[PDB]
Design a protein around this ligand. Structure first.
Ligand SMILES: NC(=O)c1ccc[n+]([C@@H]2O[C@H](COP(=O)([O-])OP(=O)(O)OC[C@H]3O[C@@H](n4cnc5c(N)ncnc54)[C@H](O)[C@@H]3O)[C@@H](O)[C@H]2O)c1
Ligand SMILES: NC(=O)c1ccc[n+]([C@@H]2O[C@H](COP(=O)([O-])OP(=O)(O)OC[C@H]3O[C@@H](n4cnc5c(N)ncnc54)[C@H](O)[C@@H]3O)[C@@H](O)[C@H]2O)c1
Ligand SMILES: O=c1ccn([C@@H]2O[C@H](COP(=O)(O)OP(=O)(O)O)[C@@H](O)[C@H]2O)c(=O)[nH]1
Ligand SMILES: O=c1ccn([C@@H]2O[C@H](COP(=O)(O)OP(=O)(O)O)[C@@H](O)[C@H]2O)c(=O)[nH]1
Lengths: 338, 341
């Protein structure tokens, strides 16, 4: 039995489905800031028999009575915490919004969790905590420093989790630094369906590919990379989902405390390479506006996979070609989302 | 004709600072939740401010209570906000980090948001020398590396960062981050001073608690340091001089080429824990039984301020020395041994 925060969202979507399919039970809480209930209806059907073990509610983590009601009626073995705003660029423009939602929401969740004696957490952290890396592939113990308010929320919230653990050794925490999840379930029955104007690269791309946005703005062209565009470690959302189930099994291992794990593929890809990958998979051509660097972006970021392999027995198995096929497969069949 | 909201204004530094605002011609509205104070301090500031008492207003309000705070900002054109409110004990922060993060960050964020809503984007923030961490170079300059070593110190580091983010987001904001060193003492009248609720975590309130007989002994946190007496060295400033620094900061806030500046408020001198205990014993005539214990989680070896920048840009320099600090502490305590009764 698992509480999934922001589980109507992109990665949450997929992870819930994986939980359901792995024998677990799931309660989702989500305020539908960047998702709708409709995504979980599709996870329900897609999950088949196991779909009877999913239940979901419209709750803001900051609504403490609403969240208390949730933990009242169910004992949680673990919380998986995906809820938050996640856009570097929105961040720089709207810092309070982000410290409000991410830190206040999370602090409330940690407080309620303790109050009801659920003290095992998997936390959605981000490669953004590496800020602008000095070193080729970012290890877990690389220097941690943020560059923008979203980065700082995640960095701050990791430090806050370390502080909780240290205060109270009943707590079992795993911090997962996701690099750049992309793709969809290969069925194409679910996928990324952000509300509002999209912020992430590939939901923006899919929407341009389908008529919903006029062009993709490329953020920066003078980077010190082989084609001038920024480089990221793009990872198949389904691999990312699976790594959460491995986090979950790791939670009651030997003597875990407050462990951090990168979840990436270890390979860097430029924004243009991603475009071109997407165009290969889609056969559609993406109009591009070349713009300046987006405030807050790192230049090259990609994972060390070694710690996650050694300790979670987890590795990503899909490559770019798969991520784009699955995305296109979801996008083709679901051009307006849900 | 100037109007100031003081968060945490019932507290040690807030109380003294509110008094100096009043004597200074300012009008002050205080919002406190009496988590670590009582109304008595502001009753007493009123009387002491004399005629200027008429310009003090005090509401009992938690910064996290957004409706209440909106009400306050509705009814009064505030020219600037001094934000003192928060939990401050590093020992408690380690045991209860959520309390600290919750109160300190939710509290501040909600204030920043209400301020921005009602067009009051002038902030003077209670930061702390604790964000200097374990400093490589002393004196500690406003340019030096910043860092925290415990939850409390994280709330100040993180909030400075947030203020910096808010500034970058929105150039209307003018923000001074005041890094207090170690406030000590009381109004020389003896009529007000520090009175924390429950167990004091700061060194000198704990000392005066032992001296009047509330507390059996002072635990010395560290005797194995690389100081002249092996005890931790800090920069202790008269709270009354700290308060004048706020007046200096408010004046400064009315300068064009300001946006988000750090100023140290210290004396620039270091004093061991045992030197402060010796100086208090001289001021009071009391013996302070000492338990020698280990270092406190996060404590720095040596921390004192560079005063250079605050001298040049704020036109402010601490005027009281250690003897004066201990004289007024004792003048307040002797007569109010258990605080506002
Ligand atoms: N997608 C990425 O590239 C990436 C990379 C690293 C880390 N992350 C983090 O992973 C998590 C999930 O990412 P995602 O791509 O699934 O984002 P998403 O927006 O698809 O999902 C997040 C969900 O959180 C919900 N939510 C937001 N604030 C909430 C609140 N206060 N209370 C309740 N629900 C709330 C949203 O409605 C949304 O459904 C986030 O914490 C994000 O910051 C994402
Ligand atoms: N005193 C020091 O040694 C020192 C050193 C560095 C920084 N500081 C900072 O200076 C500020 C003032 O310190 P102080 O010595 O006056 O402490 P204090 O405890 O006397 O003052 C804090 C005041 O804030 C109030 N308060 C706390 N949380 C509140 C909330 N959520 N809403 C409303 N009121 C709230 C308390 O009731 C109290 O009156 C604090 O922010 C502290 O962290 C103090
Ligand atoms: O409209 C967009 C969205 C993203 N990106 C770039 O694509 C990469 C992936 O960014 P995204 O926002 O998806 O994730 P982030 O790396 O910020 O977590 C980065 O180099 C972004 O600058 C871009 O150029 N245009
Ligand atoms: O009960 C106490 C409180 C404080 N200190 C020491 O006194 C100095 C100042 O402590 P305080 O907490 O007042 O100041 P901070 O350094 O936290 O701002 C530090 O070296 C503390 O270790 C101590 O020995 N015993």
């Amino acid at each position: 039995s698992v509480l999934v925060t922001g589980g109507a969202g992109y990665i949450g979507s997929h992870t819930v489905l994986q939980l359901l399919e792995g024998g677990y039970s799931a309660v989702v809480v989500d305020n539908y800031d960047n998702s709708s209930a409709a995504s979980l209806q599709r996870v329900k059907k897609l999950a088949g028999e196991n779909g009877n073990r999913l239940s979901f509610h419209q709750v803001d983590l900051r609504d403490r009575p609403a969240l208390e009601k949730i933990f009242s009626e169910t004992k949680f073995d673990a919380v998986i915490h995906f809820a938050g705003l996640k856009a570097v660029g929105e961040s720089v423009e709207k810092p309070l919004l982000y410290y409000n939602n991410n830190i206040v929401g999370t602090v409330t969740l940690l407080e309620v969790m303790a109050q009801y004696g659920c003290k095992n957490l998997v936390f959605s952290s981000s490669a953004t905590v590496y800020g602008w890396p000095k070193e080729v592939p970012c290890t877990e113990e690389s220097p941690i420093s943020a560059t923008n308010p979203y980065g700082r929320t995640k960095l701050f919230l990791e430090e806050i989790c370390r502080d909780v653990h240290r205060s109270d050794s009943e707590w079992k925490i795993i911090l997962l630094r996701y690099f750049n999840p992309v793709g969809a379930h290969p069925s194409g029955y679910i996928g990324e369906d952000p509300l509002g104007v999209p912020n992430n690269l590939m939901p923006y791309v899919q929407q341009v590919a389908v008529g919903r946005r006029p062009h993709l703005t490329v953020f920066g062209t003078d980077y010190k990379t082989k084609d001038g565009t920024a480089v990221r470690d793009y990872i198949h959302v389904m691999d990312l989902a699976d790594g959460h189930i491995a986090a979950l099994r790791k939670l009651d291992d030997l003597k875990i405390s407050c462990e951090v794990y990168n979840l990436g593929t270890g390979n860097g890809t430029s924004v243009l390479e991603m475009v071109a990958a997407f165009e290969k998979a889609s056969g559609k051509k993406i109009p591009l506006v070349m713009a300046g660097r987006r405030p807050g972006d790192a230049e090259v970021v990609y994972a060390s996979t070694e710690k996650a392999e050694r300790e979670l027995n987890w590795k990503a198995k899909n490559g770019i070609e798969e991520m784009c096929r699955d995305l296109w497969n979801w996008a083709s069949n679901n051009p307006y989302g849900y």
